[PDB]
Write a protein that binds this DNA or RNA. Sequence first.
RNA 1: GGUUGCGGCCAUAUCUACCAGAAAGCACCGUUUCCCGUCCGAUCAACUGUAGUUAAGCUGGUAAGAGCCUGACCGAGUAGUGUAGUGGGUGACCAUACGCGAAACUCAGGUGCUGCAAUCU
Length: 171
Amino acid sequence: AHFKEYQVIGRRLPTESVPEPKLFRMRIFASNEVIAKSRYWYFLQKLHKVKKASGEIVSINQINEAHPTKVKNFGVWVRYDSRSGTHNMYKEIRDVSRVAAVETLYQDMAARHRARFRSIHILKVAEIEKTADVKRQYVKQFLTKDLKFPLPHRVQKSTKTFSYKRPSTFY
RNA sequence: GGUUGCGGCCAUAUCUACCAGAAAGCACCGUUUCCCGUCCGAUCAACUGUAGUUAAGCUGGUAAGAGCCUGACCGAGUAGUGUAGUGGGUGACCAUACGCGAAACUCAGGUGCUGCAAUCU
């Protein structure tokens, strides 16, 4: 579904010798809470000696975008598995939210490298609104002062199967 | 607490090399008339409590000791693996989901514990 940024705070189960464990937290983009808690145990199993059975999740929360109607430059660092091996890349994309850029990121990763969600780890989603922090020319071109372009060859959708005049693609 | 006899678990007890051991206790031990097998009273058998021997046995301590034992979010949730998909990949194989989960390695700690009957300044 629509990716939602969840904060997931969990810990290892409290034993007698070690009450109050170290309370690790992650921000993971997921469709829903069930996948959020699942993705949490998957990564926390990767960085620590803990699995779902031996730990508990102490807080699950949604993080909302601070201002969902300002467009920003998002610096995305990702590792993914291709058929041959593993690679780390830094991509970047315009958006208004962290989540929709991550939705965009998974679409681009699937399209350009045939990477399924199973294969992708989102290392760090970073926002910058200051130029010269933007490295990719496919994003720099929308930051030129006084941007303006046409939308040539406008194709208009037809509700009916027949029309009674050749179409016009003017704009 | 030492020691002896009988033990239990059977190295946290073994192994190497040094250092120490008061009283209690093997025996430094001494002897061959007697029971007792032989080349050998060395082992084994029997007889004594002697110069007074702790030299050895034994016990303890030491050693960035070997070994052994215990533990660890140490490696490592790794390897492996139960279940699942009309997942990926030509394949070889791999990723993912729900579970189980090592061994090496590394780091620490530990040098037997203990039952019964006696005996001991």
